[PDB]
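TL;DR need structure tokens for one chain.
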Amino acid sequence: PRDDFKEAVNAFNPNPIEKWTGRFNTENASVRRRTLNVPGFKSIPTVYTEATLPLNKDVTDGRLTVVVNINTVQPFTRRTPLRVKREKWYTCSSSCHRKHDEFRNKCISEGGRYTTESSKCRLGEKCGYCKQNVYLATLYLVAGSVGGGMYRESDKYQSALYPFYDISQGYEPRQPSSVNVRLYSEGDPFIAFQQLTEGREE
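>> reply
TL;DR here they are.
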């Protein structure tokens, strides 16, 4: 559990990632060394290279194409949809008629669509869900280590965020004019945190 994370943090070597300069599309990349604050641990080092991509000709028919040309990393291209769906379920908890229809209203009100799954919203019941439009703000990429000081985009980790799919990215209710791109190493504690935990707590 926490020991597996301990195993990852200690093994992590951020030194090679300090060389990950280059470009995401047009923009120059900048290596960022930051700290991961988790209870019971000294400040954990997380390192990635990043850039801010403006929405321009890199957008075509709702998809953002990013070309990754980072040093020591075998270059690759990634395509990501600007828009995806966010499905959230309402459960009638002890905390549900009054709290149910507002959840319903928020969904509609915020541009989403609500779907009923039960004729009546009883305690402990999945009464329905909201399908919400969310838009790409932050894009996480992962490069797996190859021998000889070289890297290559990770097949298993299509993202740095659990569950690590292509679309497992930072999506917002309101689409920004620019997208922030980030490239991680597989051994980064942020990914290890995400994996072992999924929900940012141990």
